[PDB]
Design a protein around this ligand. Sequence first.
Ligand SMILES: CC(=O)N[C@H]1[C@@H](OP(=O)(O)OP(=O)(O)OC[C@H]2O[C@@H](n3ccc(=O)[nH]c3=O)[C@H](O)[C@@H]2O)O[C@H](CO)[C@@H](O)[C@@H]1O
Ligand SMILES: CC(=O)N[C@H]1[C@@H](OP(=O)(O)OP(=O)(O)OC[C@H]2O[C@@H](n3ccc(=O)[nH]c3=O)[C@H](O)[C@@H]2O)O[C@H](CO)[C@@H](O)[C@@H]1O
Ligand SMILES: *[C@@H]1O[C@H](CO)[C@@H](O[C@@H]2O[C@H](CO)[C@@H](O)[C@H](O)[C@H]2NC(C)=O)[C@H](O)[C@H]1NC(C)=O
Ligand SMILES: *[C@@H]1O[C@H](CO)[C@@H](O)[C@H](O)[C@H]1NC(C)=O
Ligand SMILES: *[C@@H]1O[C@H](CO)[C@@H](O)[C@H](O)[C@H]1NC(C)=O
Ligand SMILES: *[C@@H]1O[C@H](CO)[C@@H](O)[C@H](O)[C@H]1NC(C)=O
Ligand SMILES: *[C@@H]1O[C@H](CO)[C@@H](O)[C@H](O)[C@H]1NC(C)=O
Ligand SMILES: *[C@@H]1O[C@H](CO)[C@@H](O)[C@H](O)[C@H]1NC(C)=O
Ligand SMILES: *[C@@H]1O[C@H](CO)[C@@H](O)[C@H](O)[C@H]1NC(C)=O
Ligand SMILES: [Ca+2]
Ligand SMILES: [Ca+2]
Ligand SMILES: [Mg+2]
Ligand SMILES: [Mg+2]
Ligand SMILES: [Mg+2]
Ligand SMILES: [Mg+2]
Lengths: 419, 438
Amino acid sequence: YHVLFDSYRDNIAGKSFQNRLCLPMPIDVVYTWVNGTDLELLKELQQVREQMEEEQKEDISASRFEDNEELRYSLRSIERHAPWVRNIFIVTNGQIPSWLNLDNPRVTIVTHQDVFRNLSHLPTFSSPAIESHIHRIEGLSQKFIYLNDDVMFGKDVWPDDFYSHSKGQKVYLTWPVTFADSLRYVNKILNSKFGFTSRKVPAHMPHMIDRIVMQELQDMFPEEFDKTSFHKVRHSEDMQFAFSYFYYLMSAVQPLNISQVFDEVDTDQSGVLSDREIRTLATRIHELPLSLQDLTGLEHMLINCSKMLESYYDPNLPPVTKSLVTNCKPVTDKIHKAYKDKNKYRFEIMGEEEIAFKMIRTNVSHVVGQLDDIRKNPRKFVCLNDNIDHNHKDAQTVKAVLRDFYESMFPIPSQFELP
Amino acid sequence: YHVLFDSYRDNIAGKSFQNRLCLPMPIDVVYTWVNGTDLELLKELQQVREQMEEEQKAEDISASRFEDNEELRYSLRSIERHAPWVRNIFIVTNGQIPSWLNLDNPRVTIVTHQDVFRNLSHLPTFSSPAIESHIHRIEGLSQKFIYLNDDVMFGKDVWPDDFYSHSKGQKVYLTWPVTFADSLRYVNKILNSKFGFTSRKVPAHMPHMIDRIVMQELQDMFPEEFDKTSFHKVRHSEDMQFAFSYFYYLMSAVQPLNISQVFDEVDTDQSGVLSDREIRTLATRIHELPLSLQDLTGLEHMLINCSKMLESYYDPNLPPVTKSLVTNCKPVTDKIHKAYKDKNKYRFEIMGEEEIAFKMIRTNVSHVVGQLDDIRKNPRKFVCLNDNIDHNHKDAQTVKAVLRDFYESMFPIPSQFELPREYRNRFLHMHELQEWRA
Ligand SMILES: CC(=O)N[C@H]1[C@@H](OP(=O)(O)OP(=O)(O)OC[C@H]2O[C@@H](n3ccc(=O)[nH]c3=O)[C@H](O)[C@@H]2O)O[C@H](CO)[C@@H](O)[C@@H]1O
Ligand SMILES: CC(=O)N[C@H]1[C@@H](OP(=O)(O)OP(=O)(O)OC[C@H]2O[C@@H](n3ccc(=O)[nH]c3=O)[C@H](O)[C@@H]2O)O[C@H](CO)[C@@H](O)[C@@H]1O
Ligand SMILES: *[C@@H]1O[C@H](CO)[C@@H](O[C@@H]2O[C@H](CO)[C@@H](O)[C@H](O)[C@H]2NC(C)=O)[C@H](O)[C@H]1NC(C)=O
Ligand SMILES: *[C@@H]1O[C@H](CO)[C@@H](O)[C@H](O)[C@H]1NC(C)=O
Ligand SMILES: *[C@@H]1O[C@H](CO)[C@@H](O)[C@H](O)[C@H]1NC(C)=O
Ligand SMILES: *[C@@H]1O[C@H](CO)[C@@H](O)[C@H](O)[C@H]1NC(C)=O
Ligand SMILES: *[C@@H]1O[C@H](CO)[C@@H](O)[C@H](O)[C@H]1NC(C)=O
Ligand SMILES: *[C@@H]1O[C@H](CO)[C@@H](O)[C@H](O)[C@H]1NC(C)=O
Ligand SMILES: *[C@@H]1O[C@H](CO)[C@@H](O)[C@H](O)[C@H]1NC(C)=O
Ligand SMILES: [Ca+2]
Ligand SMILES: [Ca+2]
Ligand SMILES: [Mg+2]
Ligand SMILES: [Mg+2]
Ligand SMILES: [Mg+2]
Ligand SMILES: [Mg+2]
């Protein structure tokens, strides 16, 4: 209300910090949904025949394209635990769920036609290739949550669970470093670019993605992401969606700005460094404990720069202006050496305590046990990956168990369902 | 206006979640400040003379407990620079008024011990814990407020995210396991008696965010010893520490188990009757994994028996499992109590001491200079310079000068709460000002 709006300027500064107190909104959810239809196996079988026909002179296991009713219950989980989401985007080959309520303005189907920039990759059948273009959806919010169609919210989620203005995005990591091969390939690329370091793969969970950061990452590696889009099957040489994005967010650096250093040392907004400001600059430049020798050396460097181009204790010291510091080679050299490289983005490394990731390894008793483990300990993010044979007789029993578990957690039909 | 208001209703639910997204507002700052005036020194000598005659029948008074090292001025400057979101500032001054304070500013207010203590029988307080025991009683104070110690200040840049988050509650900054140490041990024994034995760590010397409701509940839970620490006229060995008690009440307040809530969180159908899937969820919650068929069968047998005493299930004789049937079923409720461990009433988030700068100013120039340089090299969110100066050594003046120079390097620009250097408050006490008005 008007009283609520004026309350933001009711502080000592007489200014509104609503953009700094209210979390980044609006936020959208993007899904990648694939189904094995009558016209999808036919196009799938065209590619598989030409894969092994040339190289001599497993990825495609039907668990990559099978519906276990996971999208419907993921949408129900969003409606139940994340009611703050604005719009839902479902990215498909043109397949539309038989139960999806297209008349609902909040949910839209986005075909690969509108997503891929170069349409010579339309028969995709590859999650990394589709995900590399997931940030190009028209009308997408700058902050959006990418859902993997197996992941869903289990307990309750708020934008604070992904992003904080103070510490930036939350990065949930797991065990260190086709999926493993792609992880190692991206790890080598990041070692070449940002330097050698140890990395840990992000958890299987809804990922918050910034469109600007993702676009900058893809501009930094145009050829790698073009190759990722080119492939029609998950390959060892494609950029993993979450690993590359999060370890670019955590590794991107910003060039040091001497003007910013001067402004943050010159605390009185005068443009000239006083004795105290020179002292704090010397402290930030040299290595503690500070001695009179270091301060005298800094004074000598400033005096020499002045000769070769308020009141002070040293009578020979000129007024230390921003120009005198920026145009001084040794002082700027010391600034560049002492100041460690700063990250362009803020991030907060988290743990996997609130993430329930489980693989459905076609065993009815074990599947029931792990679903019961989810039931007893409700976690914030739940992932149920498909490792079923889909030809075994137990496959239908496993699907029934999963459907019963889903119905137990989310029985109420969502607004995205045809009545 | 309306465009901004309609933004929060633009979601799948169609509701506004602004209260869950936009942090707790407003937030106020409370200061406790004391000056070594002649009038205060006269009352100080009365207590110490009576203090000596008490111990003869069978330091908490030293000047470092009361001396003004100009820390309040630079703390207000730090608030104006790094925490511009604060609404109002309250200073509890023992009736005094800082000479440089600009009382004409409507965002700074002097509150005296008269309006703070419950009864006026121990007004000559001279004890920080006693004054802190009534901080939450300030009229017009916001529900969540940050208590400033007049020598702690904001160092880098702070936001309400550094104190509170809706998802994870208040942030608790703990440093190391447990007169100040004696008070910590006393409160630790009290908490061991009340909430049970555990390992505890003292909160950091920093701006502490306090909720008025939580503090009032804590003081209602321990009325006798809070009144005891209230009526002490000197910092005492056995008194309730302000931050330790509040934070380990926030982290230890448990809430009694509610069977209706458990049923509602298991009955996801919102129908009032547990289905077979919901009964399996309840069995998983109660029993220890793996959930054998024997355990579920036993649960079903217990439900059937207790139904006999007073949507098609697998058991044809199993009645509809209603909420009333579960609440009136003694064995399943006992097993729920034995399985569901006690949940905390308040949500909190334990933090580290990485962004906290706490140092002891132990009247050595070569060491104070090094410590302040360490602050200069590595800015931190919260900086505390705790007074430990000898105050009779010749180096006290030089140490004060070094501290003032460090403060001026950090915050040179005068704040909005200061009078111009050519002006000064006419009266240094509230009662004199009231006499001047009337
Ligand atoms: C939560 C998480 O970290 N998920 C990652 C995981 O997925 P995972 O290994 O679980 O890959 P899935 O088989 O679940 O496929 C991932 C997603 O791609 C979709 N899909 C798949 C094939 C297809 O032709 N069309 C289509 O849209 C699925 O519907 C699903 O939404 O490893 C993949 C390969 O590194 C990544 O791409 C995924 O982001
Ligand atoms: C940041 C922090 O955790 N500080 C705690 C620390 O303070 P510490 O041991 O540093 O206590 P100080 O000497 O700084 O005094 C604390 C506060 O009380 C004020 N004061 C003191 C004496 C007096 O007669 N009037 C008056 O108003 C001071 O101005 C200051 O605001 O240990 C005390 C022991 O109980 C606690 O109470 C303080 O909360
Ligand atoms: C996913 O693909 C399957 C397989 O094509 C679809 O199931 C078909 O649905 C149509 C329309 O109702 C029926 O006429 C066919 O008999 C079904 N085929 C099979 C093999 O079951 C299904 O509708 C697609 N969509 C979803 C959301 O699962
Ligand atoms: C699209 O990709 C194909 C891959 O063969 C390439 O030949 C073509 O040039 C690309 N199109 C554009 C417009 O870059
Ligand atoms: C299925 O899991 C159970 C334990 O739940 C195990 O004993 C059994 O051997 C598994 N069956 C197969 C075929 O691997
Ligand atoms: C503290 O009290 C002394 C005692 O005379 C007085 O001179 C001084 O102005 C007071 N200080 C402040 C900061 O108000
Ligand atoms: C002041 O405090 C208590 C209540 O907190 C009151 O009953 C008591 O009489 C007063 N103290 C003394 C010493 O009379
Ligand atoms: C349990 O929670 C419900 C929520 O509606 C509340 O009405 C009820 O009083 C609670 N039961 C108790 C406190 O015994
Ligand atoms: C102050 O510390 C220095 C070393 O930092 C030491 O040499 C000196 O003796 C100390 N002075 C006192 C009075 O303790
Ligand atoms: Ca200056
Ligand atoms: Ca039910
Ligand atoms: Mg799948
Ligand atoms: Mg998956
Ligand atoms: Mg003090
Ligand atoms: Mg102190």
